[PDB]
């Protein structure tokens, strides 16, 4: 199916304590493949997936230069934005950047994206056409005019429609044994009485990849949200993901309920019931 | 492959 490549950067100012903390991570779909951490000893972009380790010295040198340059730009930007907002030098502030590209199952470009935040709020974003920006507030209108003068959208679009998709295609081929394999969920169900009249049914999905999944409880074949609890999809720590969905049911009526599981690794959705 | 272009805000 479809695939994505995304980079996430976070810069945090540290008032009265020198340089900000800068962390960069890169992903192909839900798999991290590179990192840079300003607090780490190497001061290099480092590998985080086996299939990127084959890239040569020139690749690691250029990636390191890219992320170091972005960290320097962010450190200046933290001070510039503090000025646009008339904030004091006392507080810690954060800049976040996300960018990346999506390709279809045939490897062709689908969409590109670049968005930035300041203190957890939207600051500026590249529009869908990759030719203009949307500023979230008046401070961001100053940045928008600078970026128009710098032809920043042309640079972003050239990267997103070019190098981004070409390198994503190379990574998908080099790491195909893991990146292009789906791991369907392994499902099970538990039952826990709560009182002499109700019980919790919990539907589990474990060991799946990619992370996108849908768990839905139905009662008499009708979707139900009342008396349900769905936890956020979480990482197992081994490259796979987990999720559960629970419903509180009257004891004696468990057979009215079914858990429906949808995932890319399943050609047909699963339907689980408490007893056979 | 990360982006190589940056310009001040």
């Amino acid at each position: 199916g479809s695939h994505s490549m995304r980079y996430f950067y976070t810069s945090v100012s540290r008032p009265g304590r020198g340089e900000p903390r800068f962390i960069a991570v890169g992903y192909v779909d839900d798999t991290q493949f590179v990192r840079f951490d300003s607090d780490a000893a190497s001061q290099r972009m480092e590998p985080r997936a086996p299939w990127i380790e084959q890239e040569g010295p020139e690749y690691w040198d250029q990636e390191t230069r890219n992320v170091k340059a972005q960290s320097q730009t962010d450190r200046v930007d933290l001070g510039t934005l503090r000025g646009y907002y008339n904030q004091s030098e006392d507080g810690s502030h954060t800049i976040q950047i996300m960018y990346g590209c999506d390709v279809g199952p045939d490897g062709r470009f689908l969409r590109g994206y670049r968005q930035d935040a300041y203190d957890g709020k939207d600051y500026i974003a590249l529009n869908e056409d990759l030719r203009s920006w949307t500023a979230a507030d008046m401070a961001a209108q100053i940045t928008k005019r600078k970026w128009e003068a710098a032809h920043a959208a042309e640079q972003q679009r050239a990267y997103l429609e070019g190098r981004c998709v070409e390198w994503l295609r190379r990574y998908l081929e080099n790491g195909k044994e893991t990146l292009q394999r789906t791991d369907p969920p392994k499902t099970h169900m538990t039952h826990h009485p709560i009182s002499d009249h109700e019980a919790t049914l919990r539907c589990w999905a474990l060991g799946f990849y990619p992370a996108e999944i849908t768990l839905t409880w139905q009662r008499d074949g009708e979707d139900q949200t009342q008396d349900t609890e769905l936890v956020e999809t979480r990482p197992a720590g081994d490259g796979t993901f987990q999720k559960w969905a629970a419903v509180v049911v009257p004891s004696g009526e468990e057979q009215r309920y079914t858990c429906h599981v949808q995932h890319e690794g399943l050609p047909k959705p699963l339907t689980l019931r408490w007893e056979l | 492959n990360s982006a190589s272009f940056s310009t001040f805000k």
């Binding site: 996430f8 976070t10 991570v25 810690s92 954060t94 203190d119 957890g120 720590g237 | -």
Partner: protein, 100 residues
């Protein structure tokens, strides 16, 4: 200026079986700013050498991190995750339950 309180899930990498080696995870998400203190506890005591993932964030800009360590569940030993963040007046402790 806007601060978001962390959501916390504490759970094992594989379904727990008493006496079987496994990994204890504490996934913290939905928080802002990124500065956070996360500890894994065994019988109320801090476990040393716990590792964590590289900081990343979701579509709404909130951060997420996975803290993890090897462990061997037993019937009576209790495991937990303790989290501190600027949005919390006191540390938040979530106990590990093998079916959650």
């Amino acid at each position: 200026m806007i601060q978001r309180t962390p959501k916390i899930q504490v759970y094992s990498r594989h379904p727990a079986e008493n006496g079987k080696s496994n990994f204890l995870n504490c996934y913290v998400s939905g928080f802002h700013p990124s500065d956070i203190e996360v500890d894994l506890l065994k019988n109320g005591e801090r476990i040393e050498k716990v590792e964590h993932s590289d900081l990343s964030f979701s579509k709404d800009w909130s951060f997420y991190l996975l803290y993890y360590t090897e462990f061997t569940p037993t019937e009576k030993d209790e495991y937990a995750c303790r989290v501190n963040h600027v949005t919390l007046s006191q540390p938040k402790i979530v106990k590990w339950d093998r079916d959650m």
